[PDB]
UniProtKB/Swiss-Prot annotation:
The chain holds residues 792 to 826 of 826 of the full protein. Phosphorylated on tyrosine residues. The unphosphorylated form increases the initial rate of actin-nucleating activity, whereas the tyrosine-phosphorylated form inhibits actin-nucleating activity, enhances actin-bundling activity and enhances actin-severing activity by reducing high Ca(2+) requirements. The tyrosine-phosphorylated form does not regulate actin-capping activity. Residues 29-32 are annotated as: Absolutely required for activity. This is Villin-1. Specifically expressed in epithelial cells. Component of brush border microvilli. Consists of a large core fragment in the N-terminal portion and a small headpiece (HP) in the C-terminal portion. The core fragment is necessary for both actin-nucleating and -severing activities, whereas the HP binds F-actin strongly in both the presence and absence of calcium and is necessary in actin-bundling activity. The Gelsolin-like 1 repeat is necessary for the actin-capping activity. The entire core fragment is necessary for the actin-severing activity. Epithelial cell-specific Ca(2+)-regulated actin-modifying protein that modulates the reorganization of microvillar actin filaments. Plays a role in the actin nucleation, actin filament bundle assembly, actin filament capping and severing. Binds phosphatidylinositol 4,5-bisphosphate (PIP2) and lysophosphatidic acid (LPA); binds LPA with higher affinity than PIP2. Binding to LPA increases its phosphorylation by SRC and inhibits all actin-modifying activities. Binding to PIP2 inhibits actin-capping and -severing activities but enhances actin-bundling activity.
Length: 35
């Protein structure tokens, strides 16, 4: 994903996402159907 596409999907930047706990990172990936 481009940075703008990432922000569109997850509502946050890649670096913000990386600050989330792993459990929430994985929650969001499943939720959005990615990775």
């Amino acid at each position: 994903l481009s940075d703008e596409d990432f922000k569109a999907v997850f509502g946050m930047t890649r670096s913000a996402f990386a600050n989330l706990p792993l459990w929430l990172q994985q929650h969001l990936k499943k939720e959005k159907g990615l990775f």
